[PDB]
Design a protein around this ligand. Structure first.
Ligand SMILES: Nc1ncnc2c1ncn2[C@@H]1O[C@H](CO[P@@](=O)(S)OP(=O)(O)OP(=O)(O)O)[C@@H](O)[C@H]1O
Ligand SMILES: Nc1ncnc2c1ncn2[C@@H]1O[C@H](CO[P@@](=O)(S)OP(=O)(O)OP(=O)(O)O)[C@@H](O)[C@H]1O
Ligand SMILES: [Mg+2]
Ligand SMILES: [Mg+2]
Ligand SMILES: [Mg+2]
Ligand SMILES: [Mg+2]
Lengths: 196, 196
């Protein structure tokens, strides 16, 4: 399970305006909301055979194609299906939170998230020390997926040109070159239809 | 071990220019270098009784005061001692990498890192789902530690005013208010002497 180059698909989802929300809600509520959210979103990943790499604050990092082998087309099919399922689950989560006066009330709006997906080469395996290590992916490909997530609009799914090669033309909303932090050359991005 | 408010100290260390280095070095070398680095840096954390929260790419997140209770003064003493020990270990790591032509040669410079340390309230405990959860800290206090790391110069240690309350005046190099992403009010920062 040592680190080696591999073609994988990385998905990043990140809650919109979690900072403000993490101030207008008691620590008790913030913890419950975030965990209820993470529970449903990780379910979306697992049900689509993805791997939950880690959580980073209000974000979820998911991998497709590692550790288990997966074809390039299936990696994309599953990652997009995951993102679309996450949005569906979110709509249901907010209905419940609304009734519990956890969102929509006071100054905390319904939860929304941004999602970026990129497919490319990465060094994947166990990183860390003998005392503490974790399976993850390293390389510019991971940075790209993260910048796509940060660049896209709330409740939207932005993917790279690589990922878009496997997506029907009818499902591509917008094609646009963007300058992503850390990457020299402009990156072609495609916002895809959020509906399953 | 459920999430609850707690006064803790968060330390973030992040490799300078890892992107460029993660391109001028074969995936094999990048993986070895990063793991050798992580091995020595996590050792610094553990030997100073800190907790390794997680790794985020080229960064290490460490906590002091959770899960094990620790006084505010000891949290700071240990976090700073950790940062200072990390710099010392780095100097030794580069000597070895230099001899192995892993750094200093071609276009890959000796490894350097940025470090930010902040102490404050955070909701700490297990976050995630029944299927996958991890012990971590959540809240603006964590964002502050991360922004201090990003704001400081290579091979330097930047801490917040809270942390500086426990640091001798002779060890404070520079005091300066900085606008950190995500935080409304300006944050008072203090760059501390890197030598043990
Ligand atoms: N538990 C954690 N583990 C690791 N890094 C963390 C962290 N919590 C925070 N950080 C770091 O602090 C940064 C900001 O934390 P957010 O991600 S919770 O907040 P935002 O999404 O930027 O804010 P928004 O736009 O209002 O939703 C993270 O990116 C991490 O680098
Ligand atoms: N394994 C991983 N797990 C989680 N997030 C990751 C990741 N790898 C990358 N990211 C995300 O991608 C971002 C950039 O990756 P870097 O941290 S390796 O690179 P830099 O430090 O910004 O570059 P530098 O200035 O040249 O040293 C991370 O902050 C994460 O949000
Ligand atoms: Mg967010
Ligand atoms: Mg975030
Ligand atoms: Mg870095
Ligand atoms: Mg980094």
């Amino acid at each position: 399970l040592r680190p080696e180059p591999r073609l994988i698909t990385i998905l990043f989802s990140d809650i919109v305006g979690f900072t403000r929300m993490s101030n207008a809600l008691q620590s008790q509520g913030v913890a419950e909301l975030l965990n209820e959210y993470l529970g449903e979103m990780t379910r979306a990943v697992f049900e689509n055979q993805g791997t939950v790499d880690k959580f980073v604050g209000d974000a979820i990092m998911a991998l497709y194609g590692a550790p288990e082998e997966m074809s390039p087309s299936e990696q994309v099919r599953r990652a997009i299906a995951t993102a679309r399922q996450m949005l569906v689950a979110l709509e249901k989560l907010n209905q419940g939170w609304q009734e519990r006066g956890l969102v929509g009330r006071n100054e905390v709006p319904p939860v929304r998230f941004r999602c970026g997906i990129h497919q490319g080469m990465a060094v994947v395996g166990l990183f860390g020390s003998q005392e503490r290590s974790d399976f993850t992916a390293i390389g510019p490909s991971v940075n790209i997926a993260a910048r796509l997530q940060e660049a896209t609009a709330p409740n939207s799914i932005m993917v790279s040109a690589m990922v878009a090669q496997y997506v029907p033309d009818e499902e591509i909303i917008k094609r646009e070159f963007l300058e992503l932090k850390g990457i020299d050359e402009p990156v072609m991005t495609c916002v895809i239809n959020p509906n399953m």
